[PDB]
Amino acid sequence: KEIPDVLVDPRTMKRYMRGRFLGKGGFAKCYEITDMDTKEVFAGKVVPKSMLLKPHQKEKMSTEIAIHKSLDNPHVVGFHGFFEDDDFVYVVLEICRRRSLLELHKRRKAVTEPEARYFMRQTIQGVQYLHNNRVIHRDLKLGNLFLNDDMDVKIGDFGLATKIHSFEVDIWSLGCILYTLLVGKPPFETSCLKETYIRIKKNEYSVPRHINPVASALIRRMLHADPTLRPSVAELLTDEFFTSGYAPMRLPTSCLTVPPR
Numbered sequence: 001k002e003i004p005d006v007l008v009d010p011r012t013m014k015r016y017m018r019g020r021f022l023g024k025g026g027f028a029k030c031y032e033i034t035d036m037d038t039k040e041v042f043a044g045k046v047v048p049k050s051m052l053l054k055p056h057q058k059e060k061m062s063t064e065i066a067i068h069k070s071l072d073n074p075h076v077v078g079f080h081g082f083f084e085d086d087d088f089v090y091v092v093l094e095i096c097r098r099r100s101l102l103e104l105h106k107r108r109k110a111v112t113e114p115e116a117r118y119f120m121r122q123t124i125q126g127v128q129y130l131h132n133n134r135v136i137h138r139d140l141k142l143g144n145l146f147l148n149d150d151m152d153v154k155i156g157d158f159g160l161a162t163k164i165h166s167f168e169v170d171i172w173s174l175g176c177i178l179y180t181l182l183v184g185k186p187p188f189e190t191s192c193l194k195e196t197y198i199r200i201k202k203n204e205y206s207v208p209r210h211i212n213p214v215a216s217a218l219i220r221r222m223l224h225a226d227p228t229l230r231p232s233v234a235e236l237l238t239d240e241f242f243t244s245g246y247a248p249m250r251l252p253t254s255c256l257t258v259p260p261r
């Protein structure tokens, strides 16, 4: 079933123009949509109701919307109201025309330290806002770390977010990220899916010796087996890793493909 060329809602009664395709997450396609009156551009998640015929799955998305809606912070994807018609649910979000930190990783492999310092900081500051507002992400991956044309990291995809394992799962996800950024490969990545889940359980990872001691030190703590021995969000910013070495405040767009100078 076709997705309407113009999108409208009963509430605000604003007309959006479905523009360029941006991607597809699971059963949700996403288009760059544009306000026909204001010309302000937004990323519109379009989920077809044929996926939400079951009231079970229809709850999970109504929770994702519930939470994301309440949020307001320069490191979480902006929320600008959802709406539905007879066929599709439409979630209107902040536009990030530089894709996700995953794309950056895939293209760059191991980034330089300052870049990880910059990304982690900004990422963590988002993670704090969440934890401060009693929100857990539970599903933090480089794909959830979107980038705008200013190279600001903005957290998205709250499809497994929950309001109040607890907070320590997020500190785990950020460990993997800081690993992947600095090391260039995910710490528990393997082709076999069962193998990954075993590696995680038995806590099987080895940080290469090429990585900075102070970096690895923190990476060990963030991935530590005892969730209660993992650092807190507030304890991250203050860590030697962020304070010892050079930390840039802005990043060039060049970082998407090559290292900065």
Ligand SMILES: Cc1nn(-c2cccc(CCC(N)=O)c2)c2cc(N[C@@H](C)c3ccccc3)ncc12
Pocket (backbone or CB within 6 Å): 022, 023, 024, 025, 028, 029, 030, 043, 045, 077, 093, 094, 095, 096, 097, 098, 099, 100, 143, 144, 146, 156, 157
């Ligand atoms: C908010 C928001 N959700 N999505 C989005 C929706 C559906 C699927 C996907 C890809 C798979 C995934 N990572 O989940 C992303 C965006 C895409 C972009 N920008 C575009 C340029 C883009 C396209 C691919 C990946 C990242 C960004 N900006 C903001 C958003």
